[PDB]
Design a binder for this molecule. Structure first.
Ligand SMILES: O=C(/C=C/N1CCc2c[nH]nc2C1)c1ccccc1O
Length: 113
């Protein structure tokens, strides 16, 4: 019960791949995505985006063992990036960084096949 299953280890690897990805300048693109702005700070976010997601929530689902496979986790990452790209303009850094991380996620999944 203290030993992680292979699926649990794979989930953790994918999550850390996204979280730890660094660009050529050593920036971790995940930083903005770890925790959403609060409902008090950014109400127009929550009136627009119906299914809010951040990496804190993904990590929480992962620790409660709510992900029974890798695609379930990928789906929540992709919802997060889709939301970021819906709320923020295409010229924005957050939009751009979401595209890159979505690519990093898909590469990671493919490499762990
Ligand atoms: O879009 C996200 C963040 C957007 N910001 C722009 C507006 C703003 C005001 N204060 N802080 C911010 C951050 C986001 C973050 C985490 C996960 C998913 C997201 O869509």
């Amino acid at each position: 019960s203290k030993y992680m299953t292979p699926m649990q280890q794979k989930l953790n690897e994918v999550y850390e791949a996204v979280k730890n990805y660094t660009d050529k300048r050593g920036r971790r693109l995940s930083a903005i995505f770890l925790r959403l702005p609060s409902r008090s700070e950014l109400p127009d976010y929550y009136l627009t985006i119906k299914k809010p997601m951040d990496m804190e929530k993904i990590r929480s689902h992962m620790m409660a063992n709510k992900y029974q496979d890798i695609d379930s986790m990928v789906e929540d990452f992709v919802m997060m990036f889709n939301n970021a790209c819906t709320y923020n303009e295409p010229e924005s850094l957050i939009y751009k960084d979401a595209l890159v991380l979505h690519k990093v996620l898909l590469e990671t999944r493919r490499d762990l096949e």
